[PDB]
A and B are shown apart, each in its own frame.
Chain A
């Protein structure tokens, strides 16, 4: 799911973070019980799979744009 966090003083809020929910953790102790939720930005898509490719007559910045656009970023 997609998550967005806003914060401010006296309801003058502004956006701090945008991203996607990845993990859910529970913790129980003698007099405590909580839920912890973790999220990351969309860039996380670029860290999941090993690849192999030949590139041709490109500058480094053409390559950097290609790697990013492949994940819809």
Chain B
């Protein structure tokens, strides 16, 4: 089943543990997207005093 073109699926759920399915709540696409994209952000605190060459 390597040769099978897999299609993207989306399922809906009722609880925050993802174990109780919504009835008739599954979507299957007929054409796959070309690409997809992720985004990651980390935030820091950058206060420093005047007269200094680097911040803590």
Contacts and interface: CB of A to CB of B under 8 A. Distances in A.
Interface size class for chain A? Answer: under 10
Interface of A: 31-33
Interface residues of B, number: 3
A33 B44 CA distance: 12
B47 interface: yes
Contact of B43 (A31, A32, A33): A31
5 contacts: A31-B43, A31-B45, A32-B45, A32-B47, A33-B45
Contacts of A32: 45, 47
A33 B47 CA distance: 9
A32 B44 CA distance: 10
B56 to A, nearest CB: 11
A31 B43 CA distance: 9
A55 to B, nearest CB: 52
Interface string B35-56: 0000000010101000000000
Nearest to B43: A31
